[PDB]
């Protein structure tokens, strides 16, 4: 799966 | 709920909850500070984001493991179904209930561009994981509020951040996925992670060692992306 | 709730929880399944020990947490005692659900060893877990009742099962913990888990491969913690 | 601190 903006 | 504490303390709260990983209650912390009606700061906005991200991120870690056991099972009982449907049904929730606190009244209150467009792209990102699940023609409806957040967004973004904007580039990034895993258009998802890379690439001369870092580690990821999707 | 769900449903339903990671969900179909009055097989009680051991594990995790953190302000407001207080309640919620499984009427219809042995550990354990959270004259009477289900277990096992056997070791492994960490008795701690440990040994020779991993597992935890030990 | 029987 494409990897989306992380929680930071 | 959480009507009797103060603002103040609910943001407290959530930063504790969020040391605790105890994301579920950083989530409802955030949203009872929403319901008080200010306005919420940067950080403030990267909690909220935080908690409903962890949150919904558990819940479609689950529907995707239970929808592959079911999809098995299509090659024996109602049970797998039912218990993706009730996953489903807590997830559709917690969407709903992000997409609300966004309509009432984070989006309309939002006048500066970082604000606007933080909210514009998780209106983008909540209805995209509404999408992941949806089947129609609920499913195109979905994909096009999804697609229209994240296009006002962007718009915005370009006219009004610099390209290495770390929200800037989350939002392009997120747009990105939603192109290639959601819309079905993988050529549109690699133009923009391409175009998006390459201007942030050009403008990190602009900024500090500190920024630098926080640019590069969002463009890493399309990056990546761009290496899975070639 | 989950009165109206067949009970092989819902110990289907904990085994997909499982396999999704969703232990909140899993403890519940557990519970529901216990209420339905029947005993509980081997494998049934796995999937309610599993369930439990990861709900309050997370709640343990954070409780900790907070508990170091208000040890900190206290070298600024209610705020982390409020969190701290509230995360605890909820913890010794979910160990009275357990105990009250155990005691309506999980420990009363057990006749079996292997039965009988399992459910007097597990009433052990939450009430170890109750008194990690205690704090008195509560706490003696909680760590009393942690000590008396752990020996009434151990005597059972001692007389009933094979010194691998993995809920004896299991046993023995958590009994060796409560000395540790909750009676303040290392010395009772490390002998017991150096007789567990020799005695498994001296009866390996009796098992099969799988057998022999099974038991293997938990020696090592025992000799780990002797290692932490001395 | 000490490690206590694992969920398995």
């Known amino acids: ?5 992380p929680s930071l | 709920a959480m ?3 103060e603002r103040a303390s609910l943001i407290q709260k959530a930063k504790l909850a969020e040391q605790a990983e105890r994301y579920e209650d950083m989530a409802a912390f955030m949203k009872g500070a929403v319901e008080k ?8 906005r990267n909690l909220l984001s935080v908690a409903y991200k962890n949150v919904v991120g558990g819940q479609r870690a689950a529907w995707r493991v239970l ?3 079911e999809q098995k099972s299509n090659e024996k009982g109602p049970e797998v179904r039912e218990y993706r449907e009730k996953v489903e049904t807590e997830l559709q929730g917690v969407c709903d209930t992000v997409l609300g606190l966004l309509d009432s009244h984070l989006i309309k209150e939002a006048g500066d561009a970082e604000s606007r467009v933080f909210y514009l792209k998780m209106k983008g990102d909540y209805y995209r994981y509404l999408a992941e699940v949806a089947t129609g023609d609920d499913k195109k409806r979905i994909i096009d509020s999804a697609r229209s957040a994240y296009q006002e967004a962007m718009d915005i973004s370009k006219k009004e951040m610099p390209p290495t904007n770390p929200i800037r580039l989350g939002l392009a990034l997120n747009f990105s996925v939603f192109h290639y895993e959601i819309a079905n258009s993988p050529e549109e998802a690699i133009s923009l ?6 201007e942030a ?18 463009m890493q990821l399309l990056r990546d992306n761009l290496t899975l999707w070639t």
Not at chain 1, 1 to 5: G, K, L, Q, T
């Open chain 2, 201 to 218: 690439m050009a403008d990190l001369h602009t900024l500090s060692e500190d920024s630098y870092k926080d640019s590069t580690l969002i």
């Open chain 2, 37 to 44: 009606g200010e306005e919420l700061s940067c950080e403030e």
């Open chain 1, 1 to 5: 799966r494409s990897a989306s903006e």
């Open chain 2, 193 to 198: 992670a391409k175009t998006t890379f390459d």
């Open chain 2, 3 to 5: 009507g009797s504490m």
């Open chain 2, 67 to 69: 929808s592959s056991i």
